[PDB]
Design an enzyme around this catalytic site. Structure first.
Site, short mmCIF file in Angstrom:
data_model
loop_
_atom_site.label_atom_id
_atom_site.label_comp_id
_atom_site.label_asym_id
_atom_site.label_seq_id
_atom_site.Cartn_x
_atom_site.Cartn_y
_atom_site.Cartn_z
N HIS F 105 50.22 9.95 12.47
CA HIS F 105 50.81 9.90 11.14
C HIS F 105 51.37 11.21 10.58
CE1 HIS F 105 47.47 6.89 11.36
NE2 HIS F 105 48.47 6.08 11.07
N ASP F 205 20.27 29.77 42.89
CA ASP F 205 20.20 29.15 44.21
C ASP F 205 20.90 29.94 45.30
OD1 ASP F 205 19.94 27.38 46.33
OD2 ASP F 205 20.45 25.62 45.09
N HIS F 208 20.55 28.30 49.03
CA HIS F 208 21.48 27.37 49.68
C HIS F 208 22.54 28.08 50.49
CE1 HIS F 208 24.72 28.04 46.84
NE2 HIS F 208 25.46 27.14 47.46
N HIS F 214 26.23 26.24 53.70
CA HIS F 214 27.55 26.85 53.87
C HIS F 214 27.72 27.50 55.25
CE1 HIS F 214 28.89 25.99 49.80
NE2 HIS F 214 27.79 26.52 49.31
N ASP F 360 29.80 21.86 48.64
CA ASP F 360 28.92 21.66 47.48
C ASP F 360 29.29 20.33 46.82
OD1 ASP F 360 29.30 25.09 47.08
OD2 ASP F 360 27.32 24.25 47.46
S1 FES Z 1 47.81 11.84 10.89
FE1 FES Z 1 46.75 10.01 11.20
S2 FES Z 1 45.39 10.31 12.76
FE2 FES Z 1 46.56 12.22 12.68
FE LIG Z 2 27.58 26.49 47.21
#
Ligand code: FES
Ligand SMILES: [Fe+2]
Ligand code: FES
Ligand code: FES
Ligand SMILES: [Fe+2]
Ligand SMILES: [Fe+2]
Ligand SMILES: [Fe+2]
Lengths: 424, 180, 180, 424, 180, 424
Positions: F105, F205, F208, F214, F360
């Site tokens: 709006h 961690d 790991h 890895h 991961d």
């Molecule tokens: S002006 Fe109506 S929801 Fe943004």
């Molecule tokens: Fe990792």
């Protein structure tokens, strides 16, 4: 949900099902805890895991499990989740392992899911009670080739749990001293509907096959005959004395078996050497040679069709979806071409794309989709079919037997047991 | 594969086109629910095969697809197929009444002449889009390995072998009631 | 269809390619938000038509697609299209500001010469992949039945008729703000 | 959710909406029970189901229904679910049936959804009260071509329920003794946002059209003029005395109608024979010939734009999604080319791919997506537009009328009624 | 683009086919987990580039894709690629052990000869279907802008440049562990 | 969930995590309110929004926010939702605005999200308190280039909140008087697993990386060496005194840095002019030149790897999914080719398709998928690693430091703090 309300959900005397049992999310959790957590669930067939080191992966409810053949040939079943940070221990459908290693942080496990050792043990975990910290173990008990598992410390053993249901399993599992092997390959598919629709159908729903559900699948198996197909009308249905199992089967009328399995299999099943051996073992000419389809459920989710010989587990995926994992068993010693015939036929009919199970897929989804509505959940379903038509003392067939193959007496037992399980 | 270990030899463009056109026609037949004509494309020795596929650790990967004498999504001869056609010509075939809406995108078409006169080994890639009822949508992909045999028919070919190599372990739909 | 009841006659490969190339170019135009040039491909008598599609029982299946004088997803002449182009050249066209990311895979291209000189009836299959904003993903498939007319333009053709045959009953997206 | 908390959700005096009403899953269920279960919902137009045996399928909330023309030309509406195990009774969008048969187990039904007979009746169900076991029936009442349905035993009839809202419906439904037919074809699409955003917009949101929402859609309908477009400023808005309906419209200014509908339709609508006949019937030269767009909602989810002439139902799919099923009505007796003009124009503008409704789709989704956040749900939306600008005694227009077409007085009524419905 | 502002000049059909066949072969290699052979297709000066893509207001649209010296999904030379190949030949490469199931539909192939002898600028459209484990499904689409160089190899070409233009802002999968 | 039960979820003394904290939907909402609503969350880097009018859009939990550079060069952060009917105010990832206009709006806003004016103001809203009706504002506080935001009116300032965690951030943020710029481009991807798995890993961690997670990513960065790779074993880990931050790093061993970043970067980082300047500023030769990877989390979801130099925010998407938005920072004054080297390297390794972060992604998804099961949620995860190995008075490193780089002491602090936040 307090106990009172859970009791209202199914009314056996009246024969009514509250459709909320197929939809309510919370009941679903209760189910996972009070049904699946304490029942014997089908994980597959022994010949799927032959040599030591062999595993398959499936589910026991929604907990994934590893199913592994041991050195002494036992079967170990553990929760497929490393207790450290929950990574999947075994990451394949099937294969052979000397050990398992968690791929997140490298905790390692013997083929039975014991935590054997942990990287940087001495420095970081020196106090680690490796037994307390191993994945949860399930009790494993097999029945004539079918592998069952149960988490529950103190539930009746598979043998007591089955009760006289064994009698009916035997129709497929014990027709020879050779037992059964499974044709290799498990077919998996997703069906968005509640697991109970599937379970209940295999428990007691001969009605659907013998009416409109599979009219076209039957027509597919007939020679070039039309809509004037004779539906078998003589048969029996069994409701277990305890535990919610059921089975129904046709007697004498080879018409439906012919449409589904073809003449080669129907022959093998009812007449000739192998049929005779069955009659002898089964203690009856009727049992061995006169039974023509037969469907059956071992409560909750273990289902098969002796004669057609598809076996399956219904894996629950919330109240609104279920996976079907299905394979096919043959007598281990049946001839080459009978086995092959059982293969081609089961897949042509009771598979994801099979001319029968195609249509069950389509129906089940609709049932569930509708249930999304409010008014659709507000009145019971009709489970009053063939009431009070059961003797419980038949000369030959144990448990509660009826002479109307078209009955929901078995179904009524399934739900009555589900109700016991849920309210306890 | 076996046949496709080595990049195929170049082929005349009218052959490439003849085969591609075959497939487009075949897709139109399936997609337009012209099942009767589609089955007519199946050679008398038809072998219609779609192996089950599994999640395997890469050393175990030779065991990915179900084998010769092993359970499968489809494994049909001409007789089994005839029955299936007889299903999809029934107002009582619920899985195809009402009918699915399907689309077959066909591409990556590679051709190798086979031993026999007028037979060809083909590899093509597909996506199948299956839409049905209100909101049901399923999308499959994979490879079709076919053997085609030349023909006196208006289509020009019959399908001798089809191997559908699906890109799915678990089937992600509630059924496979159409044809790949 | 009407035209496609019978497998199309073979065509010269340079014709197949000329037409396929047209479509690839057209897809690049749409996919690269080059709307101005795309509209230029529309013939002056353009008829751009995408019927509504319904789930019907297979005896009732002749009524699957909306007909001639019946509501439809699109049914535009050149004037209606001009207005639509005028929309997608506005910083106030919210459905295309920011713009969608689209992809048009084009395949299964079949050609039949029409009555008129330099006109062609085409059937092709598509997937349209529409991605927009952060995580919005829509996948459409269907068939395009077109009539193409040869041309003095750099493109070589103008689109006279387009009938988009979507594989959806209910539209599974919140709008159709792009072009098929 | 106790009653107290439901009351806090909307504050009419202050003009504030708690955005949780667009998101909360539990409220959604309450809605299905207290709004959709007891309101008259739009199922379509009469000319969609002309001959006896004709049906269409839609929804009444999330319960699917069959809508069938009967032999005496009544319209039957039943829940589209067989009471046996819940399968969909009618499985097509539209067609013609002599009867319906459940495809799971073959229970059969007359075109009015009475269970007439059941396979193996004598043996299995001989006691089956086929009336108690028929699908739930809805009350059907039409208004000048629009088909409405209500589950509720004891709700006011459609005529009382509409109240003076009829007056505004007439602007489109009653411009000729011939009434209206619907152009064949209903367009369906999924919009992931709450149904109330759609309903509320059609109820009272002229503001959005007359500001930034549709600037480009307007420009699309203008000759080769730019961003100097005159927005109509004279108009009125109506808030129903009871029941939450509303409508707003422009008076005298043909500018917006020209952009949307073109000169041919705008002409037909405001000047010439057909416009005169309307003025006469409607009792006023203004009503018949001076009203230029007009939007309207019949609470909860029945919406249309007299003059543009798209009608639609908002089908709720949880709090986070809504389906739009929309068609187009024309005066049954309007000339060939006017009808065709109404067709081309409505689809060019107020359709899924229309140059107007395109953009509403895009906005609505965003609104909802944001609502996924916590802080986004923690403060009210502003519904205070044009307070205290209503007489309730206008010489010509009934109910609560305002002279500011740009007001949320109608919206305020919608929510106030929703609130009454929810708390009762 | 730059190159594709003007509809490409017509090309000999055997060139169109030679290139299309290249891509089909390349897709078979990727889709069949034949990574070793696939890397062999990469020219020694390989530049493998997949820019990050952003949701922009249409005036700002020149900034849609990440640029030259800017972060990206991939931006690899031959050395970086070698390392990546070395990953997908490890039983300890978890993202590809077990392996993904991939499909590469290739279409909309347009060819322009480049300045250098035996080099070509290509535009093609793709869908990649990636399925893995039980139920994981990812569908990508986009455009590949390549530069191909002719070759004494059995394949006939080496890939000099690849620019993958993905139709995604946010990546809708948990990784990109395969190759476009 | 009452306070008592929330307390049971994590047990620090015992070292146990209830996996329900990664799955429960309701806890997730509490988290959004009690963790994300009151913590300082990472929105990006300053050089991402340089000139006035520049914005980027991200998230602060699941509330989208606009992050805009102002005329006085401040950074404004407002909820990205118009208070009217909730439409998204800013609809692009990044760009430059003189103003913002709501596209539903047309309400308009200065670059700081104040509602300046509203269409048809005089007639419809003349009383509109435009300040009360502006989007919610967040406190913005940066730390050496990283932009943090907090909704909470009265939470400790970023500086107090960080505490001695600043010390470790400095290892990457303050190695030169020039500070850090971010290489342009943020990479975004969806990982279906709980945000805590990601946060916790970066918190503590190291385990790991230095074990099995890895192995292949390391091998990818090595010359043409195999599975005989030396993993660094000397290092330290830091647990914050308050607030749940943590960091760990290797000392002296250039092996892992070489595999990830290559010799050019590892050189730049540990030896030569730029490394010296760092040592000087950081007050220590060790800190500046001896630290080799290093990982760190600023609680809840701010994570980076000094030395590798990827920064990221974990955006929560319900308990079951998380988005990763990650970029790469370089010293603003580092040479051309070092910057480029940091670019190529970070994307080759710690990206969606990087040879590290690839894996991961794969693990984390599995962890979560399993958690779908019942028994999988019913026993705690093991958080007992390296207990009681912390001095809190190290000569050089502040807070709770340990000499075992392989410890879950940091993790334990993260969860202990999460617990404080949740129960308050
Ligand atoms: S002006 Fe109506 S929801 Fe943004
Ligand atoms: Fe990792
Ligand atoms: S989760 Fe398996 S070792 Fe860490
Ligand atoms: S559910 Fe319809 S007859 Fe059984
Ligand atoms: Fe069945
Ligand atoms: Fe070609
Ligand atoms: Fe609108």
């Amino acid at each position: 949900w307090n106990t009172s309300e859970i009791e209202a959900l199914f009314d056996e005397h009246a024969g009514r099902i509250d459709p909320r049992i197929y939809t309510d999310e919370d009941l679903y959790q209760l189910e996972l805890e009070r049904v699946f957590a304490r029942s014997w669930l089908l994980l597959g067939h022994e010949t799927q895991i032959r040599k030591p080191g062999d595993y398959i992966t499936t589910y026991m409810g929604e907990d994934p499990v590893v199913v592994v053949r041991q050195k002494d040939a036992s079967i170990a079943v553990f929760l497929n989740q490393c207790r450290h940070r929950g990574m999947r221990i075994c990451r394949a459908d099937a294969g052979n392992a000397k050990a398992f290693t968690c791929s997140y942080h490298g905790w390692a496990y013997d083929t039975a899911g014991n935590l054997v050792n942990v990287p940087y043990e001495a420095e970081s975990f020196a106090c680690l009670n490796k037994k307390e910290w191993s994945p949860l173990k399930a009790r494993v008990e097999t029945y004539k080739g079918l592998i069952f598992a149960n988490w529950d410390e103190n539930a009746v053993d598979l043998d007591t749990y089955l009760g006289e249901a064994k009698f009916y399993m035997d129709h497929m599992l014990d027709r020879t001293e050779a037992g059964t092997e499974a044709i290799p390959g498990v077919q998996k598919w997703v069906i968005p509907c509640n697991w109970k629709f599937a379970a209940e159908q295999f428990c007691s729903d001969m009605y659907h096959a013998g009416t409109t559900s599979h009219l076209s699948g039957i027509l597919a198996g007939l020679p070039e005959e039309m809509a004037d197909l004779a539906p078998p009308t003589v048969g029996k249905q069994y409701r277990a004395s305890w535990g919610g199992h059921g089975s129904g089967f046709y007697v004498g009328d080879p018409n439906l078996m012919l449409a589904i399995m073809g003449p080669k299999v129907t022959s093998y099943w009812t007449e000739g050497p192998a049929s005779e051996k069955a009659a002898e073992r089964l203690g009856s000419v009727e049992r061995g040679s006169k039974l023509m389809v037969e469907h059956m459920t071992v409560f909750p989710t273990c289902s098969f069709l002796p004669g057609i010989n598809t076996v399956r587990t219904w894996h629950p995926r919330g109240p609104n979806e279920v996976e079907v994992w299905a394979f096919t068993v043959v007598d281990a010693d049946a001839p080459d071409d009978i086995k092959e015939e059982f293969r081609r036929q089961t897949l042509r009919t009771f598979s994801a794309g099979g001319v029968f199970e195609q249509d069950d897929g389509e129906n089940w989804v609709e049932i569930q989709h509708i249930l999304r509505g409010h008014k659709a959940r507000s009145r019971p379903f009709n489970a009053e079919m063939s009431m009070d038509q059961t003797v419980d003392n038949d000369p030959v067939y144990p448990g509660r037997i009826s002479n109307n193959v078209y009955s929901e007496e078995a179904a009524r037992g399934l739900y009555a047991h589900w109700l016991r399980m849920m309210t306890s | 594969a076996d046949v496709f270990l080595r990049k195929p030899a170049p082929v005349a463009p009218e052959l490439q086109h003849e085969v591609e056109q075959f497939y487009y026609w075949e897709a139109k037949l399936l997609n337009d629910r012209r099942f009767e004509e589609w089955f007519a494309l199946l050679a008398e020795d038809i072998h219609y095969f779609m192996p089950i596929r599994t999640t395997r650790i890469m050393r175990d990967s030779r065991l990915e697809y179900s084998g010769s004498r092993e359970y499968a999504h489809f494994d049909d001869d001409a007789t089994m197929m005839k029955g299936r056609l007889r299903k999809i010509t029934s107002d009582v075939s619920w899985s195809e009444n009402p009918a699915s809406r399907t689309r077959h995108l066909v591409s990556n078409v590679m051709i190798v002449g086979a031993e026999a006169e007028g037979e060809y080994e083909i590899s093509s890639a597909f996506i199948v889009y299956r839409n049905r009822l209100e909101r049901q949508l399923d999308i499959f992909a994979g490879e079709r390995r076919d053997t085609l045999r030349r023909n006196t028919s208006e289509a020009g070919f019959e399908i001798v072998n089809r191997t559908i190599l699906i890109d799915q372990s678990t089937i992600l739909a509630n059924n496979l009631s159409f044809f790949f």
